[PDB]
Input
Amino acid sequence: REIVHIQAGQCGNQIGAKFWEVISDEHGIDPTGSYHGDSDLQLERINVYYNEAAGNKYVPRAILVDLEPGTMDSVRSGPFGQIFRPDNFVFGQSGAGNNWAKGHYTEGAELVDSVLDVVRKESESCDCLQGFQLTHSLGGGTGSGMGTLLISKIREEYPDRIMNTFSVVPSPKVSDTVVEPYNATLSVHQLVENTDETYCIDNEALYDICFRTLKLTTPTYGDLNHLVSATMSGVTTCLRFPGQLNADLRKLAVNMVPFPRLHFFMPGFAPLTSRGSQQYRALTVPELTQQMFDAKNMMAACDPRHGRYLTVAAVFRGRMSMKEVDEQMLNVQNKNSSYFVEWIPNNVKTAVCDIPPRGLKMSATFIGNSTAIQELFKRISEQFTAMFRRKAFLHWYTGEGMDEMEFTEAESNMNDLVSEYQQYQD
Amino acid sequence: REIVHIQAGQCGNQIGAKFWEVISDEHGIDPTGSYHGDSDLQLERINVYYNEAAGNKYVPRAILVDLEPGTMDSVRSGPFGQIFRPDNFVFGQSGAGNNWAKGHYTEGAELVDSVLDVVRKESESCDCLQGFQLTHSLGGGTGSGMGTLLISKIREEYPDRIMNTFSVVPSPKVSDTVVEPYNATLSVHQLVENTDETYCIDNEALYDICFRTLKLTTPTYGDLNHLVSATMSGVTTCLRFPGQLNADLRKLAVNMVPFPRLHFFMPGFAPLTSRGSQQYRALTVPELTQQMFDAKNMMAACDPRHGRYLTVAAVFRGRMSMKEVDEQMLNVQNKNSSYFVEWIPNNVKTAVCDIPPRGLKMSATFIGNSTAIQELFKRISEQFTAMFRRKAFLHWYTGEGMDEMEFTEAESNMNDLVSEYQQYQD
Amino acid sequence: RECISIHVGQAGVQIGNACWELYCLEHGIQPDGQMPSFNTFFSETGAGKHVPRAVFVDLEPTVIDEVRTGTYRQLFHPEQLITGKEDAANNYARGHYTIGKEIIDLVLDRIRKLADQCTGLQGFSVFHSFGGGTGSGFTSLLMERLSVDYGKKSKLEFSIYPAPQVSTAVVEPYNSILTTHTTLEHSDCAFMVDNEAIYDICRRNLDIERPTYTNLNRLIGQIVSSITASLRFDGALNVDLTEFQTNLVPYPRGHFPLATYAPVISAEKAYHEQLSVAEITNACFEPANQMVKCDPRHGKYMACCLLYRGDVVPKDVNAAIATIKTKRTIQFVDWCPTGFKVGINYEPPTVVPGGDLAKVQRAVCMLSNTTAIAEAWARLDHKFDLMYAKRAFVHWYVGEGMEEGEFSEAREDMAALEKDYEEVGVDS
Amino acid sequence: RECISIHVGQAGVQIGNACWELYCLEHGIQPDGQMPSFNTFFSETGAGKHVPRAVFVDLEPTVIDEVRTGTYRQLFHPEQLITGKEDAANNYARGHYTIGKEIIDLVLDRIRKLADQCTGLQGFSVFHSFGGGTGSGFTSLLMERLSVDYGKKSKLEFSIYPAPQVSTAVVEPYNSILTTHTTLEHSDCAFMVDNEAIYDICRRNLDIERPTYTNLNRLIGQIVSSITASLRFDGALNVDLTEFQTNLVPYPRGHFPLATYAPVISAEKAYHEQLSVAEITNACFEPANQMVKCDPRHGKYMACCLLYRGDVVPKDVNAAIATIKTKRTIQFVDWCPTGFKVGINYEPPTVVPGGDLAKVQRAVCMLSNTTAIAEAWARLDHKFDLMYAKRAFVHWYVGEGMEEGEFSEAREDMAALEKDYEEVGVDS
Ligand SMILES: Nc1nc2c(ncn2[C@@H]2O[C@H](COP(=O)(O)OP(=O)(O)OP(=O)(O)O)[C@@H](O)[C@H]2O)c(=O)[nH]1
Ligand SMILES: Nc1nc2c(ncn2[C@@H]2O[C@H](COP(=O)(O)OP(=O)(O)OP(=O)(O)O)[C@@H](O)[C@H]2O)c(=O)[nH]1
Ligand SMILES: Nc1nc2c(ncn2[C@@H]2O[C@H](COP(=O)(O)OP(=O)(O)O)[C@@H](O)[C@H]2O)c(=O)[nH]1
Ligand SMILES: Nc1nc2c(ncn2[C@@H]2O[C@H](COP(=O)(O)OP(=O)(O)O)[C@@H](O)[C@H]2O)c(=O)[nH]1
Ligand SMILES: [Mg+2]
Ligand SMILES: [Mg+2]
Output
């Protein structure tokens, strides 16, 4: 029944800053820590993410990890940085510098032991864990590097808990680190087989949505990470709150994974349009389904109609009829039958929660597992190869002891995921 | 039913300064000597530590001993130095200088006769003694040197009373006297077989706790000795006050000593965390047990999970259910079964008092007897040997007549305790 | 999270003067150290005075005396101000060996003292010039020791690139060739700028036809602050110095990223013109703002790092990157994908009161490693060769114990370096 | 709880002048003895005047007259001020024997008078110099008597260590060799400092290139006060003088702990710099603050005692110790575990008004016994040897009744002492 969340890397720490904000919004918990809500449900299932400390203080069940105090400090300095206890800030001193080898292989490795100890302390604080969630970037040093290391140890300690992670996937246009594909390649090599599932977030796609449908001209990462948190929070609240359908994360995982190795997801979100049009929108189930199916409302820079859909999850929040939902999902399946895989009859699955997100009447979360995902892997693998041949920045990595044959195997493994998507693309 | 306490050495005198302060806090006794409390219990069992002198004055049943008036004076100068009667200040003139030989063997020996006379006067003042307690340092001249001498004579006079002592054990990093291990070695040689039990306090560990969990950056010895007094006062109050379990010091001693020679203890204490987190803490029995088991909350620089646990005492203060306590202790035994010794079924014993420490809702004192203790002896013995071969400062000691063969036997005896811990470590 | 600045030689110190002045401007630090308010660079006293963690070395009293008599004399600790009596004479042979080697032990002990004051030494950086006696001579001597003691700390060097047309030091080629030999092998990364190129920037973007070094170093200071003050301050993407090294150095040789900085605009030029992030970065890929006289279009890129100040939205940056990747003529080496480091600080760009640059609301610094650098070495190759073939001025080194073979060797090491650039240019 | 200071010779007395001045500064004692407020050193009169329990001996009227005409002439009791008419002439033969032996009985009776004034004599300490006639000659004479009468009391000696380079006394080796012979065997512990080393401290840490003895003795006074005033004052760890002996003397030979003191900082150097306990103790293990010119890195440590003033938290001390034990290059002799005495007084460090040292909030004194001391003896060995081989100046001793065999013997005793250091150096 409970979940532990660990954030890492500057990305992960800033995403989590919005995530937790939202969760407390959902439950009426003040930036200082106490509960000042107003709904029974708000406290009722609070346990999944909060420990109530003496005084009616709620402690977010999460660990903030970094290798630079300053980022942690900036998190702590805002509202909701006060709700986190000092003991959840685990950090070192001297960066990682966006270096996998430092993060995973060497220096960051050193910190992980202290992180894990706190993890253990929290695992004991829970009655019964459902699972763990981690937030991070695929091409980052602590985000992926150190984060991955941690994951391999947590999974080891808890094989029976859900291990998932959401991660920022290097967008085709904006890479920061020259070896960002290298770090990503290494994380695939480690993560894929050490996780139950991973979500693919593309900032470029997010920037398109924010202007494309939301028509906004000023977003920052906090605004885009709001959208990210909308999908993350969407998933777990249902599990928390009363609904109609089947509201268990593990069951979601079961329904979305047809094969042990292909567990990559494309998140999307509805409704998600500018205020101008809000006066011209109608709120129906087909309306949400139109926004959910549309590739432009995906947060991943993929194109599901290019690939084939293996699995689709449609999560609904708010009062909807069962009939309408059933029929519209069927219609989707029918009309987009050319994209769905024939091996899975009725490949579109649903989940229904009766609690709407604060401020909306209804909402829906799109989760997909298509073959289209392989295109991201292909882009990375290719870029990787070029760098691999030149050893760009690999003296930094090999200087910290990372061996090229390990990287070679990592490359293969990327190619293996692509070939397996092809194996089920048919 | 009553206890006499004797403090010696600069350490012992300053620890006692906090100890007695706390005891008077517990009973509402003013720094000047009169009772101004407000609870029936506060006076009810006051007899164990105070004599009520005419005028509703309470005299702490303790003797302050030193060989330098100035330390005694500084004690006397503060609050609660006025509650002690002049007759409890027994001191000479000219130090000891942290020299066992002076303390025990020669000069300090001279003072002991006057100390003992006062002891006798107090033993008569009591109705029925339960025992005696002494506070001192293991590597100090008057603390251990003179103090030990006194102990051997008190035990002689009262074989049937409890003889225990709490002592500062030389921390691995901060020794003051070059021959501090020598003094300690000699005190083992004398103390172990002339005491019912001794507690092992490491200042280094204490400094870690104060920053580690208490997050404090200014402690002094008075703040650390506060923690010491918390454990000392924890033990005797239960004996004093109404509870549920079995509240007798001798019974504690019986339950904690499986073998005539292995009576060394590792004190620990809960709850013991910074104020920040106090808004995020929950107060339950498992909460206290988590803090009690955790080696970092031990006041001894040992590691109980390295060794094996022979005996564990869990003392609780405040209202708790019997069930909860029983179950959590069982759980501890179960989950940490790999550290407990198989010869003792249900090796974790409890004691329960219904009076909480002033200001807290609940608290717990951890007392353990592990094999891990032997590691401290090993460190000392080794250091000793090196010094022994060189006779460092032994001209001071041999100059005062201490013979090297006595020291040789002392070395053996240290090694004997280690071998006996090995004999029951299995 | 701490670092040490090292200022060797006039160039190193006078640039440092601008640098520490700027850091004072960044926080409102008074000349006496009183700061009412960046402890990564500074060490605090009980008076609230902060000491810049830096070492000033000059083997001639004069420049340090200039510091000692200026306003910042109260700021600097007397032990930070280290001076000898005699000079290197433009000559590695004395700078590294005969003269500078005598004082270096003191210097190192002051460094070590500061290293002990550091709690989390991230690393350090050394300011000097490729041609001078202490500027390059002594400098490499220092690296020889620092790389032992601080082997795992950042070893970033900043040096003035010898102007191809004007140089006051006739044996500068010889000095620089010797430094190559010894710095390549010890340092982690060396950055450089060309005062001639800078003059062109001053006259074209600032519209100033009278630049002095005190102007030139303000501009350098801007660049340095972007990577020193603002990298310790808050941002979206807080990039560390070790991260810089980890994101800028691709090979174990050295590498030599060159600086480019845009905005460099006079107050009047700022009027009537609106810069965006993208527009500023467009300027960053123009030869015109290249701080070293070396043509960006000649070579191929290997590394590139863009660091942002003030009003920068990643959204815009992303778009800008897309266009520089695809619109420009920037050729790049195969080895590299375009993973360009983006540092994004919220910390606004700062301007020196009484300076030449306009107040800007956003700013971008660019570091880049291009294959065109081999041409810079080619320049040195021939200049060295000419002198060495005639053996002009050789007695000024030989008399201090230098070997002719050594000089040949050093040239050859440079040739090898050029060959490695050749290698990188070959795409693969 | 009382003690006696003994000042023999100019060096002893002039140092004493600084010492008693400092004790007056410690409590606000007026020159006339009026104190408005440390009776371990002082004896009280009904007027509230306190008399420093000390004896001043000079065989030449002049220095004592200097006392007698200064401000502290009212402080000292006329009987404490003992003077002869003629000097020892740099010569043990007269100092210990021919001349000083005549007055010593008086001197002893004044000492005994004070011993009778003491109620709990803890002990005493003697201030002198290893090279002079009364400084070392008379001094050992005194020890010969004091060790009988006060055999169980502290016999701590403090002496100026003969500078290897400058000495005004040509027969100083001879004097010092004779003292070795007679002091080793009688005294409990002798401490020493090198005025040359001190000059280096004055010029490097105080930045003073003009030290006089009146400066030099202020610094000595600091060290002495740490162990004399502050050890009687309150602290956490109140350490006595007997405790000092019991914690510093490892063998029945002598031993000779050397002084080191950090902080020694000029006012300007104190600005902009924050010392911690740990930082001060770091300075204490630096050769640079070593008060004797003898290299700490050469020998091995046997003893070490650290005494703390003012704002010292044991917590910090513990951490500091951990690092000096493990971080440093301090080699130590097997025999010894690192039980270094920590004295921790709350009593703050004090500064002489108009002095050179900066007001500090905390301070650390270090005593240490290192094997490098044998080199100091080696210095004496050859200096003695040279003179003795030629028999230069020998008639100045022979004419007073000295024996040549005796001188050889004394050298041999020194050689034996060196051999024992050799022994200790051999680890075992
Ligand atoms: N940007 C900049 N370049 C400078 C400055 N001062 C000198 N330079 C350049 O650095 C080189 C001069 O080095 P010098 O001043 O001769 O020598 P040094 O390196 O200080 O050391 P010595 O030769 O021993 O005096 C020339 O190429 C100058 O153009 C300055 O303040 N700013
Ligand atoms: N630190 C310090 N050293 C001093 C002082 N006065 C003298 N000395 C040193 O002590 C030695 C001088 O001893 P003298 O003054 O010649 O003689 P004395 O020991 O007073 O006795 P006589 O030879 O009989 O006059 C030299 O090594 C001086 O450097 C002083 O005030 N302070
Ligand atoms: N959505 C999103 N992406 C971020 C944020 N911060 C950094 N990123 C992305 O993360 C990558 C850089 O890795 P970074 O987080 O700096 O690595 P690390 O900090 O060394 O672990 C780039 O692709 C950025 O676009 C953020 O707050 N939100
Ligand atoms: N916890 C604690 N330890 C102390 C105190 N005072 C001295 N110590 C310790 O005692 C040892 C020194 O012995 P000391 O008490 O001076 O001996 P004595 O005074 O000659 O009997 C060192 O290990 C100190 O850390 C104190 O007030 N509290
Ligand atoms: Mg110059
Ligand atoms: Mg004289």
User: Anything to note?
Assistant: Residues 259-372 of chain A form a domain with the 60s Ribosomal Protein L30; Chain: A; fold (CATH 3.30.1330.20). The longest strand of chain A covers residues 129-137. Chain A touches chain B through 13 residues (CB under 8 Å). The CA atoms of residues 274 and 280 of chain A lie 10 Å apart.
